[PDB]
Amino acid sequence: RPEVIQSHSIFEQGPAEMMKKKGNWDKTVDVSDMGPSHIINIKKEKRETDEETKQILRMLPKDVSVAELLRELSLTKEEELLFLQLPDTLPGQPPTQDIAENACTLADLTEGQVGKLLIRKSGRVQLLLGKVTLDVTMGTACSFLQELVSVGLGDSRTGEMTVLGHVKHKLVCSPDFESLLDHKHR
Amino acid sequence: TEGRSRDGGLRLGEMERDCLIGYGASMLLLERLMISSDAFEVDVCGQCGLLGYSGWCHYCKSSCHVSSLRIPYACKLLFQELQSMNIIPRLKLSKYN
Amino acid sequence: DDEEETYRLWKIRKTIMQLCHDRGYLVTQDELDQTLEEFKAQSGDKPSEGRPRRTDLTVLVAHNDDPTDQMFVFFPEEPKVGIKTIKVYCQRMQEENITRALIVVQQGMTPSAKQSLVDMAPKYILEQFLQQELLINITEHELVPEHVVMTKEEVTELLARYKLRENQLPRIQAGDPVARYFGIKRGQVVKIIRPSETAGRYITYRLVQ
Amino acid sequence: YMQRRLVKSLEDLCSQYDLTVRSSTGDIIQFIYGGDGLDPAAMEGKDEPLEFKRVLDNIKAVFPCPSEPALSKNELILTTESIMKKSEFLCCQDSFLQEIKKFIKGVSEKIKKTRDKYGINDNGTTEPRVLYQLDRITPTQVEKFLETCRDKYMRAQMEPGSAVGALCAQSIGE
Amino acid sequence: MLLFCPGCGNGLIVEEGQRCHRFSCNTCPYVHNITRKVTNRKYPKLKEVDDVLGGAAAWENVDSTAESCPKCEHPRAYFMQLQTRSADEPMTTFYKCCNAQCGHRWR
Amino acid sequence: SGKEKYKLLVEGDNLRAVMATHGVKGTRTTSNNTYEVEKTLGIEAARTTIINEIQYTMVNHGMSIDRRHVMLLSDLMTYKGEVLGITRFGLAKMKESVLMLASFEKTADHLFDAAY
Ligand SMILES: [Zn+2]
Numbered sequence: 001r002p003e004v005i006q007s008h009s010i011f012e013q014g015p016a017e018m019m020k021k022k023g024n025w026d027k028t029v030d031v032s033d034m035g036p037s038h039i040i041n042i043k044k045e046k047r048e049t050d051e052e053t054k055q056i057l058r059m060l061p062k063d064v065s066v067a068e069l070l071r072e073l074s075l076t077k078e079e080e081l082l083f084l085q086l087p088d089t090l091p092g093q094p095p096t097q098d099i100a101e102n103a104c105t106l107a108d109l110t111e112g113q114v115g116k117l118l119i120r121k122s123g124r125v126q127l128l129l130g131k132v133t134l135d136v137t138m139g140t141a142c143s144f145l146q147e148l149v150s151v152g153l154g155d156s157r158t159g160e161m162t163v164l165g166h167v168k169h170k171l172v173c174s175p176d177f178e179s180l181l182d183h184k185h186r
Numbered sequence: 187t188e189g190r191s192r193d194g195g196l197r198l199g200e201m202e203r204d205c206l207i208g209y210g211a212s213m214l215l216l217e218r219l220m221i222s223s224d225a226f227e228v229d230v231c232g233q234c235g236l237l238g239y240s241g242w243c244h245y246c247k248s249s250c251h252v253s254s255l256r257i258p259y260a261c262k263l264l265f266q267e268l269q270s271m272n273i274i275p276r277l278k279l280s281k282y283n
Numbered sequence: 284d285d286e287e288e289t290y291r292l293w294k295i296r297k298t299i300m301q302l303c304h305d306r307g308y309l310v311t312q313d314e315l316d317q318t319l320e321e322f323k324a325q326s327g328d329k330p331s332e333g334r335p336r337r338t339d340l341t342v343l344v345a346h347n348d349d350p351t352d353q354m355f356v357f358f359p360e361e362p363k364v365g366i367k368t369i370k371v372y373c374q375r376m377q378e379e380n381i382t383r384a385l386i387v388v389q390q391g392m393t394p395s396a397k398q399s400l401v402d403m404a405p406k407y408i409l410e411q412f413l414q415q416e417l418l419i420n421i422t423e424h425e426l427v428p429e430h431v432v433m434t435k436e437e438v439t440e441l442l443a444r445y446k447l448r449e450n451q452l453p454r455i456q457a458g459d460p461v462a463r464y465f466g467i468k469r470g471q472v473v474k475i476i477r478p479s480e481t482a483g484r485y486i487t488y489r490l491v492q
Numbered sequence: 493y494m495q496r497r498l499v500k501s502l503e504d505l506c507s508q509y510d511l512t513v514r515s516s517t518g519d520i521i522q523f524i525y526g527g528d529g530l531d532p533a534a535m536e537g538k539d540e541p542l543e544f545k546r547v548l549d550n551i552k553a554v555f556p557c558p559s560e561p562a563l564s565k566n567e568l569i570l571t572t573e574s575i576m577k578k579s580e581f582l583c584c585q586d587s588f589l590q591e592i593k594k595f596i597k598g599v600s601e602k603i604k605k606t607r608d609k610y611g612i613n614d615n616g617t618t619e620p621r622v623l624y625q626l627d628r629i630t631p632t633q634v635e636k637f638l639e640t641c642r643d644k645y646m647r648a649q650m651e652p653g654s655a656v657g658a659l660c661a662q663s664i665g666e
Numbered sequence: 667m668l669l670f671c672p673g674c675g676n677g678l679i680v681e682e683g684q685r686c687h688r689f690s691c692n693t694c695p696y697v698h699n700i701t702r703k704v705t706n707r708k709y710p711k712l713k714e715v716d717d718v719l720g721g722a723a724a725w726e727n728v729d730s731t732a733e734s735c736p737k738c739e740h741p742r743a744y745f746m747q748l749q750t751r752s753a754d755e756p757m758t759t760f761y762k763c764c765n766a767q768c769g770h771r772w773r
Numbered sequence: 774s775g776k777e778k779y780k781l782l783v784e785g786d787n788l789r790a791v792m793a794t795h796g797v798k799g800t801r802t803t804s805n806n807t808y809e810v811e812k813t814l815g816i817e818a819a820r821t822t823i824i825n826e827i828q829y830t831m832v833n834h835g836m837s838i839d840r841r842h843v844m845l846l847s848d849l850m851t852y853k854g855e856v857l858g859i860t861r862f863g864l865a866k867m868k869e870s871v872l873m874l875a876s877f878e879k880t881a882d883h884l885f886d887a888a889y
Pocket residue numbers: 231232233234235236243244245246247
């Protein structure tokens with residue numbers, strides 16, 4: 001390898017570097033419009049950030065609860081599936097369910113209207129579930145696929161498995177400890 | 187012995203020996219670290235290099251090569267601990283003048 | 284490049300001129316004060332001038348002892364000099380019937396050729412210098428005092444004044460860079476004149492071992 | 493721990509009577525102790541055996557001879573060389589004699605500059621005789637100066653037998 | 667860049683097939699033919715130029731009809747624009763004036 | 774005030790390369806690392822480097838040592854042609870002794886090997 005490399009004072013032209021770089025890789029062998037050479041647009045390889053899957057192409061901020069319900073109501077009239085986490089005990093009694101002040105889940109409630117979701121002015125979203133007001137906040141937003149399926153075992157050995165729709169957003173309901181303590185201090 | 191409660195006496199450490207080397211006091215260092223600590227006369231045979239007693243080397247069975255020699259007791263203790271370990275120190279004595 | 288390479292080929296040559304002036308070899312005075320612009324005359328840039336066979340020296344003879352005692356200076360071309368290249372220089376030397384030679388390598392030498400240079404011959408000695416070492420004269424440094432090789436008749440007077448043997452002097456290794464500079468061997472005594480803080484001078488001596 | 497290592501390495505060194513510093517086996521460390529052969533414990537100057545200006549002022553103040561004529565430049569150089577070529581000054585090194593002759597040349601130049609600034613004839617006859625007090629040096633003071641310098645240089649040498657490696661170890665570890 | 671199989675989610679490797687180079691899984695049949703130019707740019711950090719421009723450097727950005735500096739109102743000043751980090755940064759503008767009895771540094 | 778010149782502090786451990794670049798005056802450059810100066814400029818420059826470096830370190834703390842002491846320390850390290858330590862390996866090369874080294878470390882291996 002010749003070691004004594006030679007240099008000159010002249011200044012490199014910008015476009016000359018640009019067009020040399022251009023000519024080094026703009027060459028394309030895409031002429032093979034054939035089956036093997038073809039590629040399926042809906043099964044591209046997964047770039048790692050799951051919101052950012054598209055590395056090759058044919059050519060984000062975080063929402064809040066009032067913005068999510070504003071879009072789901074006014075922007076589109078299409079129904080949508082949410083997934084909300086409730087606190088461990090709901091402020092109710094199990095009706096004639098053979099008791100001890102245990103947990104009161106949704107499995108111990110009956111059907112019907114069970115509460116009123118009050119969106120206040122300026123972002124505050126409360127879930128009035130009686131006299132007490134639960135608070136609703138946007139949970140950790142999932143980006144991977146969440147399918148909401150049904151499993152019905154109508155026969156002893158066989159049954160029906162049915163998908164109801166894709167779950168996009170997650171809510172979290174949490175009590176208002178500031179209000180619960182400001183009712184009666186301790 | 188060691189401490190005050192045993193009426194023990196002080197310690198010429200490893201640093202005061204260096205300071206006495208620095209003055210060049212040879213006989214003071216000899217007197218401190220031999221004569222006022224543990225003085226002991228051995229008799230060393232000049233032919234076999236082993237220690238003896240009373241002008242008599244038991245090893246060679248002779249009296250015609252032994253020498254009187256002032257030595258610290260810690261050194262004699264070292265030499266007999268080494269001869270018990272079968273590491274033999276053979277003291278080759280030269281001469282004066 | 285091609286100004287820095289001719290700068291190196293000037294500086295290595297000037298260093299070898301002062302090294303041959305120090306060892307007792309007949310150096311013409313014009314080669315010691317050779318400016319770069321005068322070096323441009325008989326030697327040029329990369330395509331015209333060539334290192335390995337055009338910048339050599341065999342003119343150097345020890346004018347003190349005998350003009351048949353002579354010494355080569357070669358500038359080998361490949362960075363890692365091969366054993367066959369050493370045999371080429373050795374057969375050139377054998378045909379020319381001289382005993383001393385230098386080798387100015389560029390990046391080093393393979394360890395096989397270095398093991399060769401020890402066991403080629405006691406009569407055929409060659410000295411590996413890296414060219415990165417020769418780009419400054421280590422004798423003209425401010426930390427290296429003036430060394431002087433002594434004659435046997437002065438080493439005998441030294442050993443008779445202090446009433447010594449040879450093996451009681453301080454040592455200096457044979458692989459020492461200034462020992463490689465002066466070309467001294469095992470058994471010789473060098474004088475060192477250490478510069479003082481006052482205007483005096485102190486003298487010491489070192490045996491090569 | 494550093495001082496213990498320096499002691500165990502240096503303690504065998506000693507200054508022999510032929511003024512070499514040899515190790516335990518007898519290899520030479522230095523041919524002369526520190527180049528000059530002088531003790532660091534007897535340095536009156538900044539790492540130098542004397543400070544000539546202070547010694548000369550000492551001799552001008554301790555031995556004033558009011559009955560002696562003040563020397564000129566040439567008379568000073570002449571009587572200085574007349575003292576320094578005697579027998580006992582062969583024991584000193586060449587460097588110490590060079591430093592003495594250098595200092596005496598400096599003093600003689602000061603005498604010449606003063607007697608040129610004041611117009612003082614060297615015959616000894618100018619009328620304001622206080623002018624001979626300016627850079628006054630007499631031959632008695634020159635004799636005592638040179639004897640005091642030779643005595644301090646002879647007592648300032650490294651005495652043989654001195655455990656000089658232990659002094660190096662302690663003077664670095666302290 | 668790491669790219670992962672939609673089927674099994676192992677890491678893909680690049681290999682060459684009979685018509686194209688392919689991204690291929692090692693553990694399932696999935697392969698992806700590289701039909702067009704695909705790239706991944708690192709954009710590393712360059713050297714600091716703060717002490718490189720001080721002291722009468724070989725600047726060249728001056729041009730005819732250039733603006734005078736605002737303090738002295740003379741064109742006796744150089745100005746330059748450089749990326750300080752990688753070339754995705756928008757270039758910053760800076761200028762220094764050097765005149766007789768006048769030394770200043772500006773932005 | 775009489776001059777203004779630029780020296781170049783280099784934090785590196787290859788003195789041979791720094792001395793051989795174009796534009797650096799090789800006849801006036803030094804180091805701290807004594808072994809590099811031993812490898813490059815010889816044993817005697819290593820002796821002078823050890824002298825100047827110990828006296829530099831002593832002067833920066835306001836203590837004063839007469840130069841004969843560090844001179845003897847530098848001559849004790851380099852009287853066998855190679856810069857030796859004051860650690861136990863260099864002390865083993867300077868001192869031949871067995872009991873001196875047995876006082877230092879290495880429980881019984883020196884004594885049994887010296888018996889061997
Ligand atoms: Zn016996």
